[PDB]
Structure formats: structure tokens, C-alpha cells
Amino acid sequence: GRHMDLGKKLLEAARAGQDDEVRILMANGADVNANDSAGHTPLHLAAKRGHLEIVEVLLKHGADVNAMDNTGFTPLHLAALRGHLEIVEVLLKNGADVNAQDRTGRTPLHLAAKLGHLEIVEVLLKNGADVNAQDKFGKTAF
Amino acid sequence: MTEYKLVVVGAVGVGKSALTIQLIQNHFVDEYDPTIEDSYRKQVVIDGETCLLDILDTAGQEEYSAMRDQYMRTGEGFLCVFAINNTKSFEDIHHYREQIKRVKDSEDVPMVLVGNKCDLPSRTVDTKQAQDLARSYGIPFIETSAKTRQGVDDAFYTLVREIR
Ligand SMILES: Nc1nc2c(ncn2[C@@H]2O[C@H](COP(=O)(O)OP(=O)(O)OP(O)(O)=S)[C@@H](O)[C@H]2O)c(=O)[nH]1
Ligand SMILES: [Mg+2]
């Protein structure tokens, strides 16, 4: 009842970037890995939006750093897609899988290279991203 | 059951996400959150048969246009949405259609034209103009409102029938 409802508010707070509302919801027992209907966790929404503080907070609270939404994106896919560098770094220092595949086989490197995020491509390669990784169509990142 | 891979495409702000969340959760989101790429899953009954809808809700924003190829390769059917007070978004159906054809190397890809926001008072895109566009393309045309829920099931269920 309540616990489910704290999850939905945590999702909203993580998306809308309310750094302190997040801290409260957690201490009222909210689930750090609550899912929206698209399968996003709070860490996906915070990584997507570029809220570094909220990303740090969620990880300090046991957030699953390699959680996958219904498309198969991890938070590292989301941060890379939109060029959030410090987020990409922090996710990687907390054990993010650098070669995690979405449902079509795309790594974070695939998405970063697709959208031209060159600084993300470099940081990904420094962290053991595979240059020859293929998606499910046989296509590499380039 | 049979799984149908449905892809919702169209310009920024036409109601792709609001249509989709109406189908899945039966509620209308008044708030714009720009979509990158979201997947939704629903087990439904269509024409008396149980099936699963695997729905991808896509980015209208042109900054993500390089991701289109990928979802055009994977989708079985495309819900081509415009808003009835958004001339540009109607005109953009052409660009979406052309890319789909090129990626599937085919002129016959399951597709439905969706004129969204039919609850709105004034409109700049004529019903006749849209009916004509759909007849040119040889595809069905459905008028929807994510706000009232009008034509929501009809639109998705119609795309399913086109995949069959
Ligand atoms: N009046 C009315 N408003 C609608 C309807 N569908 C969506 N809207 C409104 O339009 C706005 C944008 O809708 P949204 O569903 O986010 O567009 P989108 O096509 O997903 O845009 P994007 O993610 O590619 S950037 C929202 O405020 C939403 O409430 C409708 O049928 N009628
Ligand atoms: Mg959307």
C-alpha cells in the first residue's frame, strides 16, 4: 500500500530532480529499485535527467547499478545517450557493466558513438568497452 | 500467444507517450516528459485471441534521429501519429514512412495513420486531408484522443490486424 506508493513518489522525485525529497522517501522505507511501467528505476531517471547528486545518493542506498528497463537499457546506456560525462564516470566506478546489451544488442558505446558523444566514447574505452562488440544485426559501434 | 512488435512514431509533442500510457495504464498524462526510447508490455484480447503487445514509444526530438534505423529494423508495425493542430507533424508522416520503407526494403509495411488530439476545438489539419493521405499510402486512418481515451484501443488493435 504505502511502500508501493513511496516507490512511485521516489520515481517522480528522481525524475523531477528533488535531491532532498529522495533522501526522505528512502528513510520512510521506499524501494530504491521501484519500477515505472516502462521498467525504469530511479537511477535510470536520474541518470537520464543528468542529476549527479541523486545518482550518488541512490548508489549509496543500494540501487542496482545494472538494472535494465523494458528496452534493456541500463543507467549507463541512458547517461551515454545523452552525454552526461560525470554520471558515466560514477556509474563505472560503482560497477556498471561497460558492455551491457539492450534488447537489440547495443552497448553504451553503440549509443554514445551513434549520438556523437566523443568524450563518452573515450571514457568508455578507458573502462574496457569492447570496440568490436556487435549488436544483434552484426553491427559494431563504428 | 502471438507477440506483436508495435512502434509509435511521430513529431515532438503529438501525444505518442500519452497514447501509449493510455493503452497501458488507462490514464492521461498532462505533463510533457520528452521520450528517448521506452518499452511497454501488455497482454490483451483482440478479435477473441490473447496476445502480447510489445510497444516501443520513440523520440520525436530530431537529436535522436540516428536511433530510428534500429527500431525500424525491429518493428513489425508502426503507429504513425500526428496531432490535428500541428501541420508540421502531419507533413512529417512522409519522412517517417520513407525511412521505414528504406530500412525494411519494402512498400508494404504494416502501418496505421493516427490523427491525435481530436478532443481539441480548432484544428489546422483536415480530416479529409488525412483520409486522403492514408488512402494514398493504402493504410487505415484512426482519429484518437489520449485525453478522452477515444480511439485508443482501436488504433493499436487496428495496427495488430495489419500485422496479420
Ligand atoms: N488535448 C490533448 N492533449 C494531448 C493529447 N495527447 C497528448 N496531449 C498533450 O500533449 C503534450 C505532449 O504529449 P506527449 O504524449 O508527451 O507527446 P510525445 O509525442 O510523446 O512527444 P515526445 O516524447 O516524442 S518529445 C502533453 O501535455 C499531453 O498531455 C490529446 O489527445 N489531447
Ligand atoms: Mg513521448
Author numbering:
A (entry chain B): 19 to 160
B (entry chain A): 1 to 164
The authors write:
Wild-type Ras GTPases cycle between an active, guanosine 5′-triphosphate (GTP)-bound state and an inactive, guanosine 5′-diphosphate (GDP)-bound state1234. The P-loop (residues G10-S17) is responsible for phosphate binding, whereas the Switch I (D30-D38) and Switch II regions (G60-E76) are critical for interactions with guanosine nucleotide exchange factors and effector proteins.
In contrast, DARPin K55 did not bind to K-Ras wt GDP but clearly bound to K-Ras wt loaded with GTPγS with a dissociation constant of 167 nM. This is also in agreement with the strong preference of DARPin K55 for GTP-loaded, active Ras in the bio-layer interferometry assay. DARPin K55 does not bind the inactive conformation, in which the switch loops are in different orientations. Indeed, there are comparable ionic, hydrophobic and hydrogen bond interactions at the interfaces of scFv6, Raf and K55 with switch 1 of Ras. DARPin K27 provides a new tool for understanding the effect of nucleotide exchange inhibitors, in particular the critical step of GTP loading, on Ras function within the cell. The comparator DARPin K55 has also been isolated, which interacts with active Ras at switch 1 in a very similar way to Raf and the previously described scFv6 and iDab6. Comparison of the direct residue interactions in the two DARPin/Ras complexes highlights that only a minority of Ras residues participate in both DARPin interactions, namely Gln 25, Asp 38 and Ser 39.
